[PDB]
Design a protein around this motif. Structure first.
Motif, PDB file in Angstrom:
ATOM      1  N   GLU A 144       0.799  -1.220   0.000  1.00  0.00           N
ATOM      2  CA  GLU A 144       0.000   0.000   0.000  1.00  0.00           C
ATOM      3  C   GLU A 144       0.840   1.282   0.000  1.00  0.00           C
ATOM      4  O   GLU A 144       0.469   2.259  -0.653  1.00  0.00           O
ATOM      5  N   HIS A 202       4.758  -0.779  -6.526  1.00  0.00           N
ATOM      6  CA  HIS A 202       3.998   0.473  -6.501  1.00  0.00           C
ATOM      7  C   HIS A 202       4.649   1.501  -5.556  1.00  0.00           C
ATOM      8  O   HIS A 202       4.684   1.263  -4.355  1.00  0.00           O
ATOM      9  N   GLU A 228      -6.589  -0.714  -8.063  1.00  0.00           N
ATOM     10  CA  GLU A 228      -6.916  -0.258  -6.711  1.00  0.00           C
ATOM     11  C   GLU A 228      -8.416  -0.181  -6.496  1.00  0.00           C
ATOM     12  O   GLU A 228      -8.932   0.760  -5.893  1.00  0.00           O
TER      13      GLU A 228
HETATM   14  O1  LIG Z   1      -8.544  11.891  -4.582  1.00  0.00           O
HETATM   15  N1  LIG Z   1      -8.446  10.924  -5.348  1.00  0.00           N
HETATM   16  O2  LIG Z   1      -9.298  10.604  -6.187  1.00  0.00           O
HETATM   17  C1  LIG Z   1      -7.223  10.084  -5.249  1.00  0.00           C
HETATM   18  C2  LIG Z   1      -6.225  10.389  -4.316  1.00  0.00           C
HETATM   19  C3  LIG Z   1      -5.075   9.591  -4.220  1.00  0.00           C
HETATM   20  C4  LIG Z   1      -4.918   8.492  -5.057  1.00  0.00           C
HETATM   21  O3  LIG Z   1      -3.751   7.703  -4.959  1.00  0.00           O
HETATM   22  C5  LIG Z   1      -3.726   6.469  -5.606  1.00  0.00           C
HETATM   23  O4  LIG Z   1      -4.717   5.619  -5.082  1.00  0.00           O
HETATM   24  C6  LIG Z   1      -4.605   5.519  -3.617  1.00  0.00           C
HETATM   25  C7  LIG Z   1      -3.117   5.569  -3.127  1.00  0.00           C
HETATM   26  O5  LIG Z   1      -2.981   4.896  -1.858  1.00  0.00           O
HETATM   27  C8  LIG Z   1      -3.107   5.666  -0.711  1.00  0.00           C
HETATM   28  O6  LIG Z   1      -2.084   6.681  -0.728  1.00  0.00           O
HETATM   29  C9  LIG Z   1      -2.135   7.537   0.440  1.00  0.00           C
HETATM   30  C10 LIG Z   1      -1.933   6.701   1.708  1.00  0.00           C
HETATM   31  O7  LIG Z   1      -2.014   7.540   2.852  1.00  0.00           O
HETATM   32  C11 LIG Z   1      -3.026   5.639   1.776  1.00  0.00           C
HETATM   33  O8  LIG Z   1      -2.840   4.830   2.931  1.00  0.00           O
HETATM   34  C12 LIG Z   1      -2.932   4.772   0.523  1.00  0.00           C
HETATM   35  O9  LIG Z   1      -3.948   3.780   0.542  1.00  0.00           O
HETATM   36  C13 LIG Z   1      -2.347   4.827  -4.154  1.00  0.00           C
HETATM   37  O10 LIG Z   1      -1.010   4.632  -3.722  1.00  0.00           O
HETATM   38  C14 LIG Z   1      -2.363   5.741  -5.420  1.00  0.00           C
HETATM   39  O11 LIG Z   1      -2.073   4.961  -6.570  1.00  0.00           O
HETATM   40  C15 LIG Z   1      -5.911   8.184  -5.992  1.00  0.00           C
HETATM   41  C16 LIG Z   1      -7.060   8.978  -6.086  1.00  0.00           C
END
Ligand SMILES: O=[N+]([O-])c1ccc(O[C@@H]2OC[C@@H](O[C@@H]3OC[C@@H](O)[C@H](O)[C@H]3O)[C@H](O)[C@H]2O)cc1
Length: 427
Positions: free
Chosen positions: A44, A81, A236
């Motif tokens: 993650e 990732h 995701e």
């Molecule tokens: O606002 N959105 O639509 C949006 C924001 C961020 C985002 O990032 C992708 O999808 C989620 C990410 O994972 C998280 O990143 C922040 C951490 O604090 C959290 O624990 C993670 O789960 C992922 O890495 C990234 O690809 C997508 C959409």
């Protein structure tokens, strides 16, 4: 090969994975579900830039390797990732610019991929490179301001670092084919393939909610990208409200695309979700399978009145009562609203429009009745392929008391036994 998500997906050469958080690997409830249900793992946060290179030139793979080792030791492939993007960049990288930033990006890629060389199935080389303003162009970032070719360079760099890994471009809000962002990414990938830029896959985050809802054209998007000569992956996935129909729809979209490698849901239990408020995953905090879980499993396995097999009688609300607390029974089937049940996306079995099949507790012998719908897990049910109907909260089966088959036989919850008094057919 059909009772768990990963195994069911494997039947078609696909995987079903999840995002793993190293900080939860000491949680037995968490690992019990994760090791059992998924055959693909994505760290993650443990393999991101800040996590892997906290200080410029100083690599650290403690957290990343813990997730990677857990995955492989438990039989799961791994998706790396992410190698290069604007988000979660360490402090030092955020302040970099131009040529020095471009070189830093390259050094990071070589360092991380070199550490995991030949052990990663897919790498999200670049992520979140496009804007959401509706222009379909690149988003303004330090990486983008070093040259529009930074993405191409990242992939070429990645290919050299580890030729065994499939290189993916990953992004969100690129699921709906009519969106400008989707087209921007499409044009870039097509350009890359035409010019020979090394890219093997496109990852669709698939973070669906009422702000950016799932649309059936997601399948068309997947098919259009697959037609460019690249594999596609749902990376995701999470769905606000966890609609059973929507989860099944997305699952079938991947199954409908030969090049769709698999599906990864972003987390194990809703309580593990980055968006827990949207209860978007397949398992509840207490570890119980949600209605959506069964819908997905059914889809992966290639899968009105509710009539009991053993009795030949229908689930009926006595005298068409609408009173809360009225225990349901078996009764000769006939055209009546008190025998008409609707299975909703939330997993409810509704009658009269706003009354719900309700379990008045969690143990054997628990009375099953009708009660005002409010969303409790004791009002949610999983419709299994074998004909059983299991309560989400209790994990127990709808059961015709004592195996009775006559009119008036009451319905209760009871440990599933595959008995005819626990099997139902709907028409
Ligand atoms: O606002 N959105 O639509 C949006 C924001 C961020 C985002 O990032 C992708 O999808 C989620 C990410 O994972 C998280 O990143 C922040 C951490 O604090 C959290 O624990 C993670 O789960 C992922 O890495 C990234 O690809 C997508 C959409």
């Amino acid at each position: 090969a059909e009772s768990t998500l990963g195994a069911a997906a494997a039947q078609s050469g696909r995987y079903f994975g999840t995002a793993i958080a190293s900080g939860k690997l000491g949680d037995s409830a968490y690992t019990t579900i994760a090791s059992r249900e998924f055959n693909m793992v994505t760290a993650e946060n443990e393999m991101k830039i800040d996590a892997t290179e906290p200080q410029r030139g100083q690599f650290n793979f403690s957290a990343g390797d813990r997730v990677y080792n857990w995955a492989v030791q438990n039989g799961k492939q791994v998706r790396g990732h992410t190698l290069a993007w604007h988000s979660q960049q360490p402090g030092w990288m955020q302040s970099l610019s131009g040529s020095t930033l471009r070189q830093a990006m390259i050094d990071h890629i070589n360092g991380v991929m070199g550490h995991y060389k030949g052990k990663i199935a897919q790498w999200d080389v670049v992520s979140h490179a496009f804007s959401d303003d509706g222009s379909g162009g690149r988003r303004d970032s330090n990486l983008q301001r070093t040259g529009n070719d930074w993405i191409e360079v990242a992939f070429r760099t990645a290919r050299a670092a580890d030729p065994a890994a499939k290189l993916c471009y990953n992004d969100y809000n690129i699921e709906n084919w009519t969106w400008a962002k989707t087209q921007g990414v499409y044009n870039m990938v097509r350009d890359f393939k035409q010019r020979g830029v090394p890219i093997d896959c496109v990852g669709f985050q698939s973070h669906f909610n009422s702000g950016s809802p799932y649309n059936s054209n997601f399948r068309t998007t997947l098919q259009n990208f697959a037609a460019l000569g690249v594999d596609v992956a749902i990376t995701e996935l999470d769905i606000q409200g966890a609609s059973s129909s929507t989860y099944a729809a997305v699952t079938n979209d991947c199954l409908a695309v030969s090049r769709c490698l698999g599906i990864t849901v972003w987390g194990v239990r809703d309580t593990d979700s980055w968006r827990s408020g949207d209860t978007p995953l397949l398992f509840n905090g207490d570890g119980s399978k949600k209605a959506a879980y069964t819908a997905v499993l059914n889809a992966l396995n290639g899968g009105g009145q509710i009539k009991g097999v053993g009795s030949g009688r229908c689930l009926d609300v006595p005298n068409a009562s609408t009173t809360d607390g009225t225990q349901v029974q078996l009764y000769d089937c006939h055209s009546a609203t008190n025998q008409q049940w609707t299975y909703t996306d939330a997993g409810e079995l509704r009658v009269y429009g706003d009354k719900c099949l309700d379990a008045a507790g969690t143990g054997n012998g628990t009375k099953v009745q009708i009660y005002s719908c409010w969303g409790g897990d004791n009002q949610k049910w999983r419709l299994n392929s074998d004909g059983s109907i299991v309560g989400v909260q209790s994990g127990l089966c709808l059961d015709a008391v004592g195996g009775g088959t006559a009119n008036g036989t009451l319905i209760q919850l009871y440990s599933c036994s595959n008995g005819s008094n626990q099997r139902w057919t709907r028409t």
